[PDB]
Design goal:
With 126 residues, the chain is an all-alpha fold. It contains 5 helices and no strands. The structure holds the ligand CCc1c(C(=O)Nc2cccc(OCC(N)=O)c2)[nH]c(C)c1C(C)=O. The PDB classes it as transcription.
């Protein structure tokens, strides 16, 4: 079975709309989403569909860009570090679960290199 997906809505969680979070949606997410290697990362790992009965035995902090997109679009975050953590979690999960040099790892590595360059350019808070 798949787990419930990560939370994307919680009215009890205080929220901010900030220029750094706006950058994360408008620049970081947009650049990553349209990348040729993005599709495996655009939704939670569907362990049923992929016949990976062990995925959620190994990965206990799942994350994906579909979830990040929802979090950004629905103003889930307080700060940019929260969002950056979600991207990092997504990449780390892929590296933990998969063999080095697997296609999925090569794809994650490509996205991560692009991610790091965009994050290095994160604007100062207004
Ligand atoms: C290698 C299996 C794997 C995928 C993958 O194949 N995803 C996928 C599969 C079907 C459709 C889809 O999305 C369809 C869409 N983008 O609409 C995405 N993604 C990750 C992160 C991993 C692992 C194990 O780390």
């Amino acid at each position: 079975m798949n787990p419930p997906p990560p939370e994307t809505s919680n009215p009890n969680k205080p929220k901010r709309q900030t220029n750094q979070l706006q950058y994360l949606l408008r620049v970081v997410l947009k650049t990553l989403w349209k990348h040729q290697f993005a599709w495996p990362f655009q939704q939670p790992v569907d362990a049923v569909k992929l016949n990976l009965p062990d995925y959620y035995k190994i990965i206990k902090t799942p994350m994906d860009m579909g979830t990040i997109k929802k979090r950004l679009e629905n103003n889930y975050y307080w700060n940019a570090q929260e969002c950056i953590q979600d991207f990092n979690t997504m990449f780390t999960n892929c590296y933990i679960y998969n063999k080095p040099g697997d296609d999925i790892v090569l794809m994650a590595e490509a996205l991560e290199k692009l991610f790091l360059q965009k994050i290095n350019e994160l604007p100062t808070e207004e």
